[PDB]
């Protein structure tokens, strides 16, 4: 399962994995990163939302949010932002270099009117359907959480049940009759078995 | 079952039954030789060799004349970063020989750019080959 | 027979096997009994060719192809005992009121703090038992100090941390000074 | 019997750096004419010596799958040959062991 | 192709015993007919329940070849005959199994006593032993009528006992 | 307090990824796959989609290549509107000597919007500890996009042009002692450069890629010291063969 | 044909931000409008046998 120390600090590598644990045995010990506490209500940003960043290396450019990690209050941007680094090193070649990008934090990015392509400040809101939505503050205009892959990978549009996958219509018929019976009563006159003995009592203590 | 309570039973009583079993077993490979027709398994604790083969009868229509079990230690050597003991889990072992001849062999589960690079030249001495002036 | 336990021979040598999703407490409830306990066998079949084949690759010294299979089965092997159980629940209350099926009581032991104790099943009653009245459900006098020093030692542990996070707190605005709100 | 005092790091680097502790330098090296690696002027070369015992363990290597077991000795001469040999004259009536292997070059028949 | 632990078959150590029945000075030392009677935990209708139909016949000639083994070998070790110093003649016996019921024949020629791999490396000739079918000596008993009784079975048995050493001129 | 006991360097001996796998099977160590919708962004590619073999001597069938170039171009004004072809190899000069002028200074910032990633350890990986004065000192040939051609989620376009000018090199190792080349004289150079750049970004720019060496070409100037390439290392058993 | 459907998707999917300015105008409320015309044993219990 989950084994996280009390004052886990959390990184780039998703928990668990091998780099995680070379970087966070369950030794060490460091001070503990200071996060502005945010409500998961109150959080805007979500991965494949167009961002602007404000403060940086490369400041007025728009991306997409590619990942998001609550705990730091992290937003990682695709394309921008970004160091270099050599990746897949051996000892007798250099390696090849690529570009990663760097975590930003949610004071340093500005969600993007899709009317006018301008950084604006967002407050949420109820639409008639009484749907929780996000409206910009200036020109209010709504915002949609983008549609983003599923972690897993799986496609609905695109799946095709194998031979251990129950069917729709086979998953969603209603069988069920409410009654007074247990499953043992039930399926014993099912089964066909019959046991005319009776129980004698016991005493509880 | 396991983990559950057991009705009392008494001179006339009806017989006990379970309509779902939560003892789940994993057949495993032999480390060292066995006979042709032994076949061998993991189970829990709580499991006896008279329910594995009621077990395994009634669930995979299976046919056993023996069944054997013993008990294996969990080495409790290892330790920690705080020097305290890590303990492998006791497990139960169970041998099953087959009863009309049948014979059972554990299956193969598990069945089966680098020369595109340029190196440094010795001739060069280690100046840089980019410059081609 | 035994070619339960492992998957299908095709599947072996692959490095993943394309798997459905896993059932929910609530298509199960749609369910009969009778199906339901015709499925849970069909659900430990597949679980025991999972454990089979995670306790091979050990052996191999290889990855499981697609672990989240096992995890799959595990929470429907474990949604369906919810069903159940909640059929049965449901149907000991109109008939006893009972909301729990294995009886007990409240009590003191020996040391004590109050503990749940569940009945066992016996055939002679409780004042013939030999081994049953050697157990003891009350203190005497020399328990109440201990109780004491247990209560304080709570009520301590309770206390920092109360005040520490009211620190954390206090703490968390000399960096973020717009919280004042 | 304790020390009465401590001693100190200057007596100490006296009695340390005293040349008699110190390594002398070695005026017996030389090179070997036939490989060029270095070896003392009363000493066989390492390299040299080493190769003959690679040579001389596969031929008694090949002496054991002709004995086939313990105390079975000879009692005539023995004679080692290499691809492209044949018994010569003198080496008529004793125990040959052949060689899948060049004759080596310093290795010279008699 | 594996160990006899397998089998399964269990080690001890304790005293070691070659014994035919009675110690060296009983001129008796020669072997005619041993009586088998099979315990109740091998008796044919818990192997039935237990899906061991196949091993009702084994058990009989298991019994046969082990203790016909022991009581032959046992008589050849008396005349001075071991691993090394094979037998010169062969050493037989008689053995009738039964479980109450049902009755098995055997017999058994202690060929060779050479066993070890120092000896039996080159040894060419083997033990050899004979077994019949079980077959009932009786169908059902009722009352004091014994019914279906079998007395081809019965002559089987006066033959072991008839049979006698031969004779000198 | 502050106590960490380090071990000496380990120095892994094998280095290829199939003989880590391998070997970490025969130590039981497993190592189950990764899990993340997180991919890394490749701003440039790895190499070229065609290679270009310039012609002998420069120092139909042909008509027909020409036209293919003209096509890929078509691509490239898909994604830039404000894009002519007779202004980029006079931009690329711009970029070419731009690009050299960051070896002299060690602008590492500044080389990254020039070239490639692909470029950039090329250039500056054998020149870490050593000094470099790199000029331009006139032009004798102009320039000429001999092909551009694109690629068949992201696509890039390759740009190759040909260049003819002088230039004065002058390399100096660590210790400042003359390593290549003459600060003084300049000499002739005749190396078709490589661009590319990210279409489907919307910051792309066009950068350096990568330099195209004919199999025809004459042989480098000559380094200043001596070499030794010795021989196979044999060990005593084995003997040497001519 | 399966593959080609694929490539719709990932295109749409990519560039949402202009397909939510090309969507009309929706009103919203500045609170939620069906919130307001929606709405609007012993944790101890071992004190009731032992004392
Ligand atoms: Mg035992
Ligand atoms: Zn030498």
């Known amino acids: 399962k989950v084994t996280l120390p009390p004052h886990y600090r959390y990184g780039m590598s998703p928990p668990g994995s091998v780099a995680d644990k070379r970087k966070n045995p369950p030794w060490i010990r460091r001070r503990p990163v200071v996060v502005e506490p945010i409500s998961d209500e109150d959080w805007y940003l979500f991965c494949g939302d167009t961002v602007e960043i404000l403060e940086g290396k490369d400041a007025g450019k728009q991306g997409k949010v590619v990942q998001v990690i609550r705990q730091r209050n992290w937003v990682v941007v695709g394309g921008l932002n970004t160091h270099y680094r050599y990746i897949g090193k051996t000892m007798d070649y250099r390696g090849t270099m690529i570009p990663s990008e760097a975590p930003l934090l949610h004071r340093q990015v500005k969600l993007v009117d899709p009317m006018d392509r301008k950084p604006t400040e967002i407050e949420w809101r109820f639409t008639e359907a009484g749907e929780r939505v996000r409206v910009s503050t200036r020109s209010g205009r709504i915002i949609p959480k983008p549609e983003f892959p599923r972690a897993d990978g799986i496609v609905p549009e695109t799946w095709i049940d194998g031979p251990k996958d129950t069917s729709v219509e086979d998953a969603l018929e209603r069988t069920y009759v409410p009654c007074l019976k247990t499953l043992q009563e039930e399926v014993m006159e099912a089964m066909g078995i019959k046991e005319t003995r009776k129980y004698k009592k016991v005493y509880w203590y | 079952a396991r983990n559950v309570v057991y009705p009392l039973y008494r001179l006339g009583g009806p017989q006990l039954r379970v309509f779902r079993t939560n003892f789940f077993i994993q057949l495993v490979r032999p480390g060292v030789a066995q006979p042709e027709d032994t076949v061998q398994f993991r189970i829990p604790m709580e499991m006896t060799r008279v329910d594995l083969r009621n077990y395994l009868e009634g669930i995979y229509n299976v046919p056993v004349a023996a069944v054997r079990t013993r008990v294996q230690h969990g080495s409790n050597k290892r330790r920690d970063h705080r020097n305290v003991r890590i303990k492998k889990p006791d497990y139960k072992v169970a041998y099953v020989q087959l009863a009309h001849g049948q014979t059972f062999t554990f299956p193969d589960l598990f069945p089966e750019e680098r020369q595109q690079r340029q190196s440094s030249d010795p001739r060069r001495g280690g100046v840089p080959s980019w410059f081609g002036l | 027979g035994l070619e339960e336990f492992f998957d299908d021979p095709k599947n072996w040598g692959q490095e993943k096997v394309k798997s459905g999703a896993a059932w929910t407490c609530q298509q199960l409830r749609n369910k009969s009994n009778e199906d339901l306990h015709k499925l849970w066998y069909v659900l430990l079949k597949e679980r025991n060719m999972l454990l089979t084949l995670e306790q091979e690759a050990k052996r191999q010294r290889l990855p499981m192809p697609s672990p989240e299979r096992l995890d799959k089965v595990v929470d429907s092997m474990d949604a369906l005992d919810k069903v159940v159980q909640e059929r049965e629940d449901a149907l000991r209350l109109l008939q006893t009121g009972q909301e729990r099926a294995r009886p007990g009581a409240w009590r003191r032991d020996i040391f004590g703090r109050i503990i749940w104790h569940k009945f066992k099943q016996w055939v002679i009653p409780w004042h013939l038992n030999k081994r049953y009245n050697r157990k003891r459900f009350f203190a005497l006098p020399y328990v109440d100090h201990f109780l004491r020093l247990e209560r304080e030692k709570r009520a301590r542990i309770k206390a920092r941390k109360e005040n520490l996070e009211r620190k954390k707190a206090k703490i968390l605005l000399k960096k973020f000074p717009h919280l004042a709100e | 019997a304790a020390p009465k005092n401590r001693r100190t790091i200057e007596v100490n680097r006296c009695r340390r750096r005293n040349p008699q502790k110190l390594i002398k330098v070695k005026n017996n090296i030389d090179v070997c004419p036939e490989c060029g690696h270095l070896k003392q002027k009363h000493v066989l070369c390492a390299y040299c010596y080493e190769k003959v015992c690679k040579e001389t363990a596969e031929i008694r290597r090949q002496i054991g799958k002709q004995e086939g077991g313990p105390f079975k000795a000879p009692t005539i001469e023995t004679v080692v040959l290499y691809t492209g040999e044949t018994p010569s004259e003198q080496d008529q009536g004793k125990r040959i062991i052949e060689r899948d292997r060049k004759r080596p070059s310093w290795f010279t028949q008699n | 192709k594996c160990k006899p632990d397998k089998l399964p078959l269990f080690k001890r150590q304790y005293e070691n015993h070659i014994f035919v029945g009675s110690k060296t000075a009983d001129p008796c030392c020669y072997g005619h007919t041993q009586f088998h009677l099979l315990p109740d935990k091998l008796r044919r209708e818990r192997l039935l329940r237990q899906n061991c139909a196949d091993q009702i016949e084994v058990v009989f000639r298991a019994n046969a070849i082990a203790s016909l083994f022991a009581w032959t070998g046992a008589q050849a070790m008396y005349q001075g005959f071991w691993s090394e110093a094979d037998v010169t003649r062969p050493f037989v016996s008689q053995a009738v199994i039964t479980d109450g019921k049902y009755f098995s024949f055997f017999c058994y020629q202690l060929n060779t006593l050479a066993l070890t791999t120092q000896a039996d490396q080159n040894n060419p000739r083997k033990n050899i032993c004979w077994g019949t079918q079980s077959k009932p000596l009786y169908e059902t008993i009722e009352d004091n009528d014994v019914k279906g009784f079998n007395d081809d079975v019965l002559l089987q048995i006066v033959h072991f006992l008839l049979n006698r050493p031969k004779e000198e001129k | 307090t502050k106590k960490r006991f380090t071990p000496p360097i380990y120095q892994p001996k094998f280095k290829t990824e199939k003989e880590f796998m391998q070997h970490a099977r025969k130590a039981g160590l497993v190592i189950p796959p990764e899990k993340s919708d997180r991919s890394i962004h490749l701003a440039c590619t790895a190499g070229i989609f065609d290679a270009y073999v310039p012609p002998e001597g420069d120092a139909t069938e042909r008509m027909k290549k020409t036209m293919a170039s003209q096509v890929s171009i078509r691509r490239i004004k898909d994604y830039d509107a404000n894009f002519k072809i007779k202004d980029f190899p006079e931009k690329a000069k711009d970029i070419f000597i731009e690009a050299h002028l960051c070896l002299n200074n060690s602008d590492h910032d500044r080389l990254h919007t020039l070239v490639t990633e692909h470029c950039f350890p090329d250039m500056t990986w ?117 | 044909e399966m593959t080609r459907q694929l490539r719709e998707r990932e295109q749409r999917m990519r560039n949402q931000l202009e397909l939510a300015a090309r969507g009309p105008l929706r009103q919203t409320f500045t609170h939620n409008p069906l919130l307001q015309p929606g709405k609007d044993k012993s944790k101890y219990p071992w004190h009731d046998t032992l004392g």
């Open chain 6, 126 to 242: 054998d020149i870490k500890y050593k000094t470099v004065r790199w000029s331009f000192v006139e032009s004798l040939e102009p320039s000429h996009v001999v092909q551009v051609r694109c690629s068949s989620g992201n696509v890039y376009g390759q740009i190759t042009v040909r260049m003819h000018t002088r230039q004065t090199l002058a390399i100096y190792d660590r210790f400042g002692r003359l390593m290549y080349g003459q600060e003084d004289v300049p000499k002739d150079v005749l190396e078709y450069v490589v661009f590319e750049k990210q279409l489907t970004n919307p910051y792309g720019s066009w950068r350096m890629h990568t330099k195209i060496v004919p199999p025809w070409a004459p042989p480098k100037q000559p380094i200043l010291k001596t070499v030794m390439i010795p021989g196979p290392q044999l060990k005593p058993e084995e003997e040497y063969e001519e």
